[PDB]
Design a protein around this ligand. Structure first.
Ligand code: HEM
Ligand code: HEM
Ligand code: HEM
Ligand code: HEM
Ligand code: 8MV
Lengths: 141, 146, 141, 146
């Protein structure tokens, strides 16, 4: 559960991504694939070589989805229903993997936006990503 | 933990530049801020009521320095982490009863702090190597549980 | 996120608890303290002896709180705000403990309402308790 | 090695009354229903689209019998769970890559199933003893991860 402060911290921090959406999203994925090889088994049909075009494009989709989630922070189950169908119903992704990508997203943000990554903001971002993770791994329809 | 010679060199090069006076305290500090329940293990550390209080707490910085020191020793004995942390594991598991999941959390927080300090120098390949290390350290710390 | 079916299942099963509230709550607590002794640490000044009146009373409080959560399944953050202040802000309970008590509540329900404890209901109650745990362990103010 | 003599007696006494042909299938079935992502590891088992489909799936029941057989083996060698599950640990960890948290989940689902069947007979002390058993089995299975 996010506090009013968590919501404003996330909006301010993620709002700095801007035109770096695809770059950061792609990097977060690359960090996950390299650091936790098992996550690669969910993308067997993907070209996972470093810097692959497919990963770059997908990184963009993930980043933009997060931007949408930030915009609908007060009604994520509703706004993310489609992604839940994909990750929970079709892909059946194990929740541990969401923890791994969430961690890699925090690492990416810390490496690119040091001034934004304060302890309180870090806390809010972790709660936010955990929230998104719960919606994507829950079958609520 | 198995690190390629290339990974070993990259890990060592980065670790040698780490600010030993602050990195450990910032990692422990963020752990206490991001995962508030961990504060219950540090009742004697004084003021931990707010993020700023936690991060600036002299006792948090001092203890974080010991934590970093433990990681530094692990890096020097990657071939024998169980033995290097035997004593620490007995303390954290048998006495403090710290839940294993928390060892993993601190390890990843340390990774976030390294990313924060080194920025672009903390590349995905560098992180991957460090994840092997923190996982290895985390495992060793919880071995007395097995 | 609970599905409409989850909400229906939770209400029906918990509805069957009725006057057995304090009884099941106390048993769940006793099961937790005996199975996971570290949990006793959160109640340093309690009389946790077997069958103690204090645990019987506390079990009734926990049970009644869940009954309330059930009634407000669509807005638990609001309804359980005071309980979040206590568990998250003051006690700072490690979420691992909520998993322990939730499991003990399920074991208690399974031991008392075999006919109601179907796989589907079991699944729904688990999600409900996880949701309650998330609310009680988050600082959202 | 971790159960007290009394805990071993309780576990042994209850297990003698367990229906080895039903409990395993019930436990595996519920794991698949309660924690749906686990269904991904059983793609070839057929229809797992609904609770009834899962619980009535012959392959689920048949496999559960093997899983239960493994638990029975563990109960006959409570002092050496690591060795008893060594081979299975390589399979689940090295080959299947099942996250260890799932081992703990299956263990607790088994406990719920035992409570469901035995009811009043599954007293708090009996449960406590069994929590030791399933935690030990989960730890043994994740051994290759240590
Ligand atoms: C913060 C959490 C996550 C977000 C926001 C997210 C978002 C997305 C989005 C936007 C898509 C594209 C859907 C479309 O337009 O077709 C997608 C696809 C997918 N995601 Fe995620 N995802 C997350 C976590 C994960 C995790 C942890 C895994 C597993 C390691 C995963 C595995 C997949 C797979 C396999 C696809 C299908 C890709 C394809 O074949 O096109 N996702 N995700
Ligand atoms: C996984 C990485 C960890 C490392 C490397 C580490 C390392 C250390 C070291 C070096 C000490 C000092 C021991 C001594 O001087 O004898 C210590 C003490 C302690 N650690 Fe950890 N630790 C870790 C994780 C944790 C976690 C996650 C918690 C709990 C949230 C924890 C709680 C404590 C406490 C309460 C003390 C005692 C401090 C005191 O009262 O003096 N540690 N740790
Ligand atoms: C299903 C989840 C839980 C519910 C619904 C719940 C509910 C409650 C309620 C209603 C109270 C009494 C509040 C009052 O004084 O008015 C309470 C107190 C308390 N709870 Fe929980 N609780 C849950 C889980 C836990 C867990 C997992 C722990 C720790 C292992 C815990 C530790 C405590 C403590 C220490 C108190 C205060 C005791 C005192 O008076 O000193 N609770 N809880
Ligand atoms: C914690 C206790 C567990 C025990 C005692 C156990 C036991 C077993 C046994 C005896 C086998 C058969 C091995 C063989 O003959 O090759 C097996 C296979 C398998 N187990 Fe487990 N297991 C456990 C947990 C899990 C969990 C939690 C998952 C996944 C979420 C899992 C997934 C599998 C899969 C996919 C197979 C192979 C099935 C096939 O033949 O296709 N196991 N397990
Ligand atoms: C609001 C919020 C922040 C994190 C979470 C999920 O954590 C759990 C599972 O309790 O919910």
């Amino acid at each position: 559960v996010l506090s009013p402060a968590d919501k404003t911290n996330v909006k301010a921090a993620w709002g700095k991504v801007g035109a770096h959406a695809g770059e950061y999203g792609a990097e977060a994925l690359e960090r996950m694939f390299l650091s936790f090889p098992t996550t690669k088994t969910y993308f067997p049909h993907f070209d996972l070589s470093h810097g692959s075009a497919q990963v770059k494009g997908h990184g963009k989709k993930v980043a933009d989805a997060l931007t949408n989630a930030v915009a609908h922070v007060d009604d994520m189950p509703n706004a993310l229903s489609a992604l839940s169908d994909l990750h929970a119903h079709k892909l059946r992704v194990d929740p541990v993997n969401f923890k791994l990508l969430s961690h890699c997203l925090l690492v990416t943000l810390a490496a690119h936006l040091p001034a934004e990554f304060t302890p309180a903001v870090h806390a809010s971002l972790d709660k936010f990503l955990a929230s998104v993770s719960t919606v994507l791994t829950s079958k609520y329809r | 933990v198995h690190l390629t010679p290339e990974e070993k060199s990259a890990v060592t090069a980065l670790w040698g530049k780490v600010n030993v006076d602050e990195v450990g305290g910032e990692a422990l500090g963020r752990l206490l801020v991001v995962y508030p329940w961990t504060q219950r293990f540090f009742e004697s550390f004084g003021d931990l009521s707010t993020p700023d209080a936690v991060m600036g707490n002299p006792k948090v910085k001092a203890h974080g320095k010991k934590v970093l020191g433990a990681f530094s020793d692990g890096l020097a004995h990657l071939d024998n982490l169980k033995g290097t942390f035997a004593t620490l594991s007995e303390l954290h598991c048998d006495k403090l009863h710290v839940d294993p999941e928390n060892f993993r959390l601190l390890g990843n927080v340390l990774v976030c702090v390294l990313a924060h300090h080194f920025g672009k120098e903390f590349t995905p390949p560098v992180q991957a190597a460090y994840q092997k290390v923190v996982a290895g350290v985390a495992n060793a710390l919880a071995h007395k549980y097995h």
